[PDB]
Protein backbone atom coordinates (compact mmCIF):
# COMPACT_ATOMS: atom_id res chain seq x y z
CA UNK A 1 0.00 0.00 0.00
CA UNK A 2 2.91 2.36 0.72
CA UNK A 3 4.33 1.64 -2.73
CA UNK A 4 0.95 2.39 -4.30
CA UNK A 5 0.68 5.68 -2.39
CA UNK A 6 4.29 6.54 -3.23
CA UNK A 7 3.77 6.00 -6.96
CA UNK A 8 0.58 8.08 -7.01
CA UNK A 9 2.19 10.95 -5.11
CA UNK A 10 5.28 10.64 -7.32
CA UNK A 11 3.21 11.20 -10.45
CA UNK A 12 1.27 14.08 -8.90
CA UNK A 13 4.43 15.74 -7.57
CA UNK A 14 6.23 15.37 -10.90
CA UNK A 15 3.40 17.02 -12.83
CA UNK A 16 3.10 19.83 -10.27
CA UNK A 17 6.85 20.45 -10.41
CA UNK A 18 6.77 20.56 -14.21
CA UNK A 19 3.97 23.14 -14.12
CA UNK A 20 5.83 25.23 -11.53
CA UNK A 21 9.04 25.12 -13.58
CA UNK A 22 7.10 26.24 -16.66
CA UNK A 23 5.69 29.14 -14.63
CA UNK A 24 9.20 30.14 -13.54
CA UNK A 25 10.47 29.87 -17.12
CA UNK A 26 7.68 32.18 -18.29
CA UNK A 27 8.49 34.67 -15.52
CA UNK A 28 12.20 34.76 -16.40
CA UNK A 29 11.36 35.05 -20.10
CA UNK A 30 9.15 38.02 -19.19
CA UNK A 31 12.14 39.61 -17.45
CA UNK A 32 14.31 39.01 -20.52
CA UNK A 33 11.55 40.43 -22.73
CA UNK A 34 11.45 43.52 -20.52
CA UNK A 35 15.20 43.98 -20.98
CA UNK A 36 14.99 43.38 -24.73
CA UNK A 37 12.07 45.75 -25.30
CA UNK A 38 13.91 48.34 -23.21
CA UNK A 39 16.97 48.00 -25.46
CA UNK A 40 14.71 48.23 -28.52
CA UNK A 41 13.10 51.31 -26.95
CA UNK A 42 16.63 52.77 -26.79
CA UNK A 43 18.35 51.71 -30.01
CA UNK A 44 15.74 51.62 -32.80
Amino acid sequence: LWREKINLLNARLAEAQTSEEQLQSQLDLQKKVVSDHMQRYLQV
Binding site: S35, M38, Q39, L42
Partner: peptide, 10 residues
Protein backbone atom coordinates in the same frame (compact mmCIF):
# COMPACT_ATOMS: atom_id res chain seq x y z
CA UNK B 1 26.80 54.40 -19.79
CA UNK B 2 24.64 57.50 -20.19
CA UNK B 3 22.00 58.02 -17.52
CA UNK B 4 19.35 56.24 -19.61
CA UNK B 5 21.65 53.26 -20.15
CA UNK B 6 22.40 53.30 -16.41
CA UNK B 7 18.67 53.18 -15.66
CA UNK B 8 18.34 50.24 -18.06
CA UNK B 9 21.28 48.38 -16.51
CA UNK B 10 20.04 49.02 -12.97
Amino acid sequence: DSDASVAKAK
